[PDB]
Scaffold this active site. Structure first.
Site, PDB file in Angstrom:
ATOM      1  N   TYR A  51       0.838  -1.197   0.000  1.00  0.00           N
ATOM      2  CA  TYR A  51       0.000   0.000   0.000  1.00  0.00           C
ATOM      3  C   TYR A  51       0.871   1.245   0.000  1.00  0.00           C
ATOM      4  CZ  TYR A  51      -5.108  -0.194   0.063  1.00  0.00           C
ATOM      5  OH  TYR A  51      -6.431  -0.257  -0.304  1.00  0.00           O
ATOM      6  N   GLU A  53      -0.489   4.608  -0.436  1.00  0.00           N
ATOM      7  CA  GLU A  53      -1.410   5.746  -0.410  1.00  0.00           C
ATOM      8  C   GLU A  53      -0.665   7.058  -0.195  1.00  0.00           C
ATOM      9  OE1 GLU A  53      -4.526   4.651   2.445  1.00  0.00           O
ATOM     10  OE2 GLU A  53      -5.962   4.707   0.780  1.00  0.00           O
ATOM     11  N   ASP A 197      -6.457  14.691 -24.672  1.00  0.00           N
ATOM     12  CA  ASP A 197      -6.489  13.265 -24.373  1.00  0.00           C
ATOM     13  C   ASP A 197      -5.723  12.486 -25.447  1.00  0.00           C
ATOM     14  OD1 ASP A 197      -7.075  10.644 -23.655  1.00  0.00           O
ATOM     15  OD2 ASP A 197      -9.209  11.022 -23.331  1.00  0.00           O
ATOM     16  N   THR A 223      -3.563   7.183 -21.850  1.00  0.00           N
ATOM     17  CA  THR A 223      -3.381   5.805 -21.426  1.00  0.00           C
ATOM     18  C   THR A 223      -1.902   5.470 -21.556  1.00  0.00           C
ATOM     19  OG1 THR A 223      -3.859   5.043 -23.684  1.00  0.00           O
ATOM     20  CG2 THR A 223      -5.671   5.013 -22.103  1.00  0.00           C
ATOM     21  N   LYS A 226      -1.787   1.151 -25.474  1.00  0.00           N
ATOM     22  CA  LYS A 226      -2.018   1.604 -26.857  1.00  0.00           C
ATOM     23  C   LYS A 226      -0.685   1.879 -27.573  1.00  0.00           C
ATOM     24  CE  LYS A 226      -6.556   3.356 -25.489  1.00  0.00           C
ATOM     25  NZ  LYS A 226      -7.594   4.414 -25.630  1.00  0.00           N
ATOM     26  N   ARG A 232      -1.586  -1.594 -19.087  1.00  0.00           N
ATOM     27  CA  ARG A 232      -2.924  -1.031 -19.070  1.00  0.00           C
ATOM     28  C   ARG A 232      -3.077  -0.100 -17.864  1.00  0.00           C
ATOM     29  NH1 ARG A 232      -6.991  -2.372 -22.604  1.00  0.00           N
ATOM     30  NH2 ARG A 232      -5.473  -3.811 -23.544  1.00  0.00           N
TER      31      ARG A 232
HETATM   32  C1  LIG Z   1      -9.133  -0.640   1.262  1.00  0.00           C
HETATM   33  C2  LIG Z   1     -10.548  -0.112   1.287  1.00  0.00           C
HETATM   34  C3  LIG Z   1     -11.134   0.454   0.139  1.00  0.00           C
HETATM   35  C4  LIG Z   1     -10.435   0.582  -1.190  1.00  0.00           C
HETATM   36  O1  LIG Z   1      -8.996   0.679  -1.350  1.00  0.00           O
HETATM   37  P1  LIG Z   1      -8.347   0.825  -2.821  1.00  0.00           P
HETATM   38  O2  LIG Z   1      -6.977   1.309  -2.538  1.00  0.00           O
HETATM   39  O3  LIG Z   1      -9.208   1.811  -3.512  1.00  0.00           O
HETATM   40  O4  LIG Z   1      -8.399  -0.542  -3.390  1.00  0.00           O
HETATM   41  C5  LIG Z   1     -12.443   0.929   0.198  1.00  0.00           C
HETATM   42  N1  LIG Z   1     -13.169   0.854   1.371  1.00  0.00           N
HETATM   43  C6  LIG Z   1     -12.608   0.304   2.507  1.00  0.00           C
HETATM   44  C7  LIG Z   1     -13.422   0.235   3.768  1.00  0.00           C
HETATM   45  C8  LIG Z   1     -11.297  -0.179   2.472  1.00  0.00           C
HETATM   46  O5  LIG Z   1     -10.806  -0.669   3.492  1.00  0.00           O
HETATM   47  C1  LIG Z   2      -8.390   4.455 -24.559  1.00  0.00           C
HETATM   48  C2  LIG Z   2      -8.835   5.865 -24.255  1.00  0.00           C
HETATM   49  C3  LIG Z   2      -9.168   6.257 -22.945  1.00  0.00           C
HETATM   50  C4  LIG Z   2      -9.111   5.341 -21.749  1.00  0.00           C
HETATM   51  O1  LIG Z   2      -9.260   3.899 -21.817  1.00  0.00           O
HETATM   52  P1  LIG Z   2      -9.194   3.008 -20.473  1.00  0.00           P
HETATM   53  O2  LIG Z   2      -9.793   1.721 -20.892  1.00  0.00           O
HETATM   54  O3  LIG Z   2     -10.001   3.761 -19.487  1.00  0.00           O
HETATM   55  O4  LIG Z   2      -7.750   2.924 -20.150  1.00  0.00           O
HETATM   56  C5  LIG Z   2      -9.573   7.569 -22.701  1.00  0.00           C
HETATM   57  N1  LIG Z   2      -9.655   8.485 -23.731  1.00  0.00           N
HETATM   58  C6  LIG Z   2      -9.334   8.116 -25.023  1.00  0.00           C
HETATM   59  C7  LIG Z   2      -9.432   9.135 -26.122  1.00  0.00           C
HETATM   60  C8  LIG Z   2      -8.926   6.807 -25.292  1.00  0.00           C
HETATM   61  O5  LIG Z   2      -8.641   6.489 -26.449  1.00  0.00           O
END
Ligand SMILES: *Cc1c(COP(=O)(O)O)cnc(C)c1O
Ligand SMILES: *Cc1c(COP(=O)(O)O)cnc(C)c1O
Lengths: 405, 405
Positions: A51, A53, A197, A223, A226, A232
């Protein structure tokens, strides 16, 4: 792989099927590419167990000394590659990259100007079934009805009439070069922010084969996959003055803990993008796209904008009285993977379409040059002009297998 | 690894540093765990190269035959494990899982009732610097000032007065069992939906050591990592009647293309969770948490709620006149990783705190039993009661190294 075949045979069997599918087929979807073995190894790393954060140096938990180095490497390489003042490599996707910027500059219900979805614009650029079109008041600019190039006077007119707080430029299916200088000129007139974008063209911007939007846009989203040929995920680039606000929009704004193993792969992807052969690769992509475009016309296909300036092209199928849906289905039978795509001013609905979208990014990774561009175009002609003949489709099926070894 | 050491030495060196750091330190952060080698291999797979916009069978692109099998396996195993009618395994994170549900049930500015952030609630449960507290009108219920257990009469009072459209139950730092039956009883009285964020307790729900919220909640969100010991990501569980709406809130709602390689790892993680040894593992987690709790009290530490019912515990440090910040810093010097955490009705700000949060999920994965729980508790006592002595911290440093081989 070693531990997955033994642990989960059902999952491993499906992955091995997919691995062979990626080899056997001709991948022509403009958003698809093949990452290096080094990029994948970074995503299969223990960096998922941490983690992180917050941000490098400013974390809400200890033991981040080495993942900070990783995130820093990802941020520094991004700034080197694109000439940006600040980078954020935590966005989970391009959609989350767009969402964070919108979260920074806009309040609920604010007017935003974006590209028409039927003309090239992305789902995240104001779809009434997407968060962007629901959260914000989205208005559209279009392309010229016969040239299919962005009507920059229409962008100015829509901006001066609707008075947007933000203007979004860039597309999912636009074969030409986008004039970011004229987008900024319009944005400055109406006192609006500019966001680009570059998700589809990011790799071409990295190799200097497409104009860099960085010195024109306040915010640049993309992204990492691509044309950049990375994992990804998403990335946000901006000037120094927006750095703190963009970071706060990702965390604690819209996201929680970042994907450090994916950020690791982003760093690997950027490192690979900084090297000389990637700039040579990306030139071949555009060269292949120009060659495929010319060859498809030689077969009698009409193209949107009459060709391409980048990696992708759109085929106007109306001359052959075919829908995108029909074309996508029949090419899937021979081993060519495309996606149906609305052409500008399409009479057919977005679910049927009158066109198909083709990119050369993926095949160029496999080693496809100018010769095979003409062959791919020859097969597409054989298929789409002889839809009823199984003789032609079996012939096409064999010619796909000849290209993919 | 093979291709990363050669391609990117800087990134590989930082990953190897992190790999050794995870081995050398005692990981006691409640949100941390160590995934299996099979889970990681699934994330390092070629499934990152595939765009799968949409859902199994209902994709917006072809060539999804085998990634559909993967997503189906992930969805079916989730339903088997939790007894849910529907599952969505596409959420990029627990935050995106929460965001999608909010997007389904609520309109901008709607009143939502959630747990106080200073009492245990998560950032995504109504922080004024998070999207949830900005997008929606969030009101808080609290715990008892001396028992630290959720005041269910306060939840009823806040619900009847503020008339929320949604009630959120579950926490990031709550050591006791949450009564989901009483949360539903309250929600039905005020005509509100019920959402449970089991992210921290998900693995304990899977092993049947914590009451399942599924038959009580309309929507159940969770992280796939943490106690579930899966990859970093999110999941949404709901009844059949919300299935279509929840799916549309992920795509084309808040996200784009899913992370198929992470979904692959989710399927591996669920498969590992269905097996008998995981249920034995998860019992040891709670057993270790109960043992650590009792032992810390034996050292003279006050605990929030006077112990634990689950995987995590909070130490009230006020008796020893220590702040969470001070405790986190000094334990980092000996090799014990904790995070500072606000205790209920904390006089100190959320950035300084009066407590620390400790979980046993990660160490139990490494093979830590009841004996080493008493040792960890002995070291924590040695450190925090002798902050000024470097003699004690060096002794503690050696006792951390003795446990981690
Ligand atoms: C860990 C947690 C999340 C989400 O954490 P991500 O970093 O977004 O995966 C959401 N709600 C609770 C209560 C959590 O403990
Ligand atoms: C591919 C793309 C995204 C985002 O794709 P994700 O699946 O969310 O990664 C956003 N804007 C444009 C113009 C894109 O081509």
């Amino acid at each position: 792989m070693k531990y997955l075949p033994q642990q989960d045979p059902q999952v491993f069997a499906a992955i091995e099927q997919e691995r062979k599918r990626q080899h056997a087929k001709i991948e022509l979807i403009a958003s698809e590419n093949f990452v290096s073995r080094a990029v994948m190894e970074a995503q299969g790393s223990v960096l998922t167990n941490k983690y992180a954060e917050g941000y490098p140096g400013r974390r809400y938990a200890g033991g981040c000394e080495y993942v900070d180095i990783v995130e820093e490497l990802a941020r520094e390489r991004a700034k080197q590659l694109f000439g940006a003042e600040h980078a954020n490599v935590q966005p989970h996707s391009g959609a989350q990259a767009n969402m964070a910027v919108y979260f920074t500059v806009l309040e609920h219900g604010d007017t935003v100007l974006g590209m028409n979805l039927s003309h090239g614009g992305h789902l995240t650029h104001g779809s009434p079934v997407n968060f962007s079109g629901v959260q914000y008041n989205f208005v559209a600019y279009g392309v010229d009805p016969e040239t299919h190039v962005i009507d920059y006077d229409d962008v100015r007119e829509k901006a001066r009439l609707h008075r947007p707080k933000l203007i979004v430029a860039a597309a999912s299916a636009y074969p030409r070069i986008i004039d970011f200088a004229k987008f900024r000129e319009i944005a400055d007139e109406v006192g609006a922010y500019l966001m680009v974008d570059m998700a589809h063209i990011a790799g071409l911007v990295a190799a200097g084969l497409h104009p860099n939007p960085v010195p024109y846009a306040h915010f640049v989203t993309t992204t990492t996959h691509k044309t950049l040929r990375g994992p990804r995920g998403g990335m946000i680039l901006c000037q120094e003055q927006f750095a703190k606000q963009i970071d706060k929009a990702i965390f604690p704004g819209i996201q929680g803990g970042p994907l450090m193993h994916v950020i690791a792969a982003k760093a690997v992807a950027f490192g690979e993008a900084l090297q000389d052969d990637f700039k040579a690769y990306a030139k071949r992509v555009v060269d292949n796209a120009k060659r495929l475009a010319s060859a498809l016309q030689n077969e009698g296909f009409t193209l949107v904008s009459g060709g391409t300036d980048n990696h992708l092209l759109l085929v106007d199928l109306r001359p052959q009285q075919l829908t995108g849906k029909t074309a996508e289905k029949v090419l899937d039978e021979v081993g060519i993977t495309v996606n149906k795509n609305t052409i500008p001013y399409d009479p057919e609905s977005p679910f049927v379409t009158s066109g198909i979208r083709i990119g050369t990014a993926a095949v160029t990774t496999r080693g496809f040059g100018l010769e095979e561009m003409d062959e791919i175009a020859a097969i597409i002609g054989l298929v789409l002009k002889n839809v009823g003949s199984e003789q032609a489709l079996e012939e096409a099926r064999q010619r796909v297998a000849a290209l993919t070894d």
